[PDB]
UniProtKB/TrEMBL annotation:
Residue range from the parent sequence: 1 to 177 of 211
Organism name: Agrobacterium fabrum (strain C58 / ATCC 33970)
Protein name: DUF1217 domain-containing protein
Length: 230
């Protein structure tokens, strides 16, 4: 019974597309960063974030708040203001922190990027808080921009991105998009608790740290998908 959480409210062709982006990632992310919307918002965030010294200061700014979440993909749970605050309030360093007892590990993510809980007024003065977030909002936009077209692709890039972060079968099922890129690559509906075990023996969780083996893995995925989904 893992503490509940605000659920979303507000032919080879796939491998092809993926590869296209993944390759010249620099030009993609760079082109995106130029999009009028990403630009304007990215600007405001780069100039205001360093001024936030407290969770209050943070919550009190909708613009920055919406930015931080969209970048952590929790853009549809933004309405859970009371939830986002608690997650931040307890931080994500302590094993017992509220966010660490959740199942969707993307809350801990946010709390790691904005550690007012562990850093205090210093939290806003790190790479993870400014450069870090600014960069994910970019990847985020770029990904959902592709997903609008080929969801399989979106999953592709998202996995290539959140690849290393995984170190346990648990870390895997810990993200709908990540588990999805597995339940498909091994064609599967599985809702049991020890699926993780099945994964750790059905694959070496220690190898997914290799920016090489990772690709070949997706290789099977991007094509496994182009079939299960035309």
């Amino acid at each position: 019974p893992p503490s509940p959480q605000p659920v979303s409210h507000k032919v080879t062709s796939t491998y092809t597309s993926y590869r296209l982006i993944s390759q010249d990632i620099g030009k993609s992310l760079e082109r995106v960063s130029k999009q009028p919307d990403v630009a304007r918002e990215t600007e405001y965030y780069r100039e205001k974030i360093g001024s936030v010294k407290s969770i209050d200061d943070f919550m009190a700014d909708t613009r920055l708040y919406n930015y931080a979440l969209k970048a952590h993909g929790l853009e549809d749970m933004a309405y859970a203001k009371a939830f986002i605050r608690k997650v931040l309030t307890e931080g994500a360093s302590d094993k017992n922190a509220f966010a660490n007892k959740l199942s969707d590990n993307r809350y801990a993510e946010l709390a790691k990027s904005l550690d007012f809980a562990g850093l205090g007024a210093a939290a806003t003065a790190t790479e993870a808080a400014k450069s870090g977030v600014i960069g994910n909002y970019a990847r985020q936009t770029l990904e959902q921009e592709a997903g609008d077209d080929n969801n399989g692709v979106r999953l592709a890039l998202y996995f290539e991105r959140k690849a290393p972060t995984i170190k346990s079968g648990l870390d895997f099922l810990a993200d709908d998009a990540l588990a999805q890129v597995f339940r498909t690559t091994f064609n599967l509906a599985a809702d049991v608790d020890k699926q993780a075990a099945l994964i750790e023996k059905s694959i070496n969780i220690k190898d997914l740290q290799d920016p090489e083996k990772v690709g070949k893995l997706l290789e099977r995925f991007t094509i496994m998908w182009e079939m299960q989904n035309p």
